[PDB]
Amino acid sequence: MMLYIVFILSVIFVMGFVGFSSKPSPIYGGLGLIVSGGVGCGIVLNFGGSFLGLMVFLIYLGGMMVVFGYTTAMATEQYPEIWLSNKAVLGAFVTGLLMEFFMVYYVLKDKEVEVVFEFNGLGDWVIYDTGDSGFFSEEAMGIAALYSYGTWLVIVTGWSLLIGVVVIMEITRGN
């Protein structure tokens, strides 16, 4: 069962998404996204993306989601309605888990399902690469190349972040 770690994680990934997509109180919506993000990083790690995975934790969870929860406390929620105590929220949550359960049922049984795209249920391990013996991390080499190959990317990305600071100060001044 450990040989299907990626698939099991992706099932939890979808369940968390059905969590905040049914849109309970924003406080618990942030919790569903935080769990999904942590599971999402786990999936990326198991494909050899150690740096990319840790960026999710550092920047997406430790950065963006902290600010979401910060803003939710100040501007949105201070106490929440009990999760799944609302008709639409619970009905949406039940509907999502039924769709996920059936997708998982048919993919495991028939080893293949077809919705828009054709999906194979042999196991995500079968597509992996069989040749690895370099003395470095390919992922790290590709990211490090941002400063040599990606001059233009750095300029526009750097400009956008600076403009973000300016714009948000403009927006929030109020006059």
Partner 1 sequence: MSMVYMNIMMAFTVSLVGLLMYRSHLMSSLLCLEGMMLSLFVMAALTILNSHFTLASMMPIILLVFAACEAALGLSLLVMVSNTYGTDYVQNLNLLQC
Partner 2 sequence: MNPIIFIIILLTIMLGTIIVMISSHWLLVWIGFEMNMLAIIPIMMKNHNPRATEASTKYFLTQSTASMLLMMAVIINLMFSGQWTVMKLFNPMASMLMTMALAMKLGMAPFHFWVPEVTQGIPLSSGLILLTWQKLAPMSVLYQIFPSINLNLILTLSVLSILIGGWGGLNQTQLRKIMAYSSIAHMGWMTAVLPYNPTMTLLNLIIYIIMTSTMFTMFMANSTTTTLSLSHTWNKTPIMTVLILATLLSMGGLPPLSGFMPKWMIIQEMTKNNSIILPTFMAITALLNLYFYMRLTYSTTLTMFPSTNNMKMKWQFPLMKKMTFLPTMVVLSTMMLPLTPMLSVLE
Partner 3 sequence: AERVAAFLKNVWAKEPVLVASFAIAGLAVILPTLSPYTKYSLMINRATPYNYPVPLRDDGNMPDVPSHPQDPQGPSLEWLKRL
Ligand X SMILES: CCCCCCCCCCCCCCCCCC(=O)OC[C@H](COP(=O)([O-])OCC[N+](C)(C)C)OC(=O)CCCCCCCCCCCCCCCCC
Round to whole Å and give the CA distance between 71 and 47: 34
Nearer to partner 3, 99 or 141 (CB): 141
82 touches partner 2 (CB under 8 A): no
158 touches ligand 3PE (CB under 6 A): no
Could you tell me if 10 and 43 are in contact, meaning their C-beta atoms sit under 8 angstroms apart?
yes
155 touches partner 1 (CB under 8 A): no
3-state secondary structure of 1: coil
Ramachandran region of residue 49, left (φ > 0), alpha (ψ -120 to 50) or beta? beta
Return the range that interacts with ligand X (CB under 6 A); candidates 38-46, 79-87, 105-113, 127-135.
38-46
45 touches ligand X (CB under 6 A): yes
Q: How far is the CB of 90 from ligand 3PE (least distance, A)?
A: 9
Largest CA distance in the chain: 62
Round to whole Å and give the CA distance between 138 and 134: 8
Nearer to ligand X, 30 or 38 (CB): 38
Round to whole Å and give the CA distance between 98 and 10: 16
115 touches ligand 3PE (CB under 6 A): yes
**What is the total count of residues that contact ligand 3PE (CB under 6 A)?**
12
Round to whole Å and give the CA distance between 127 and 12: 21
Nearer to ligand X, 18 or 45 (CB): 45
The H or E element that residue 33 is part of is helix 26-45
Residue recorded with tokens 């949105």? 76
Q: Within 13 Å, how many C-alpha atoms sit on residue 165's CB side?
A: 5
* Residues of span 127-166 touching partner 2 by CB under 8 A: 152-153, 156-157, 159-160, 163-164, 166
Q: How far is the CB of 137 from partner 3 (least distance, A)?
A: 12
Q: Which residues bind ligand X (CB under 6 A)?
A: 34-35, 38-39, 41-42, 45-46, 50, 53-54
Q: Which residues bind partner 2 (CB under 8 A)?
A: 116-117, 152-153, 156-157, 159-160, 163-164, 166-167, 170-171, 174-175
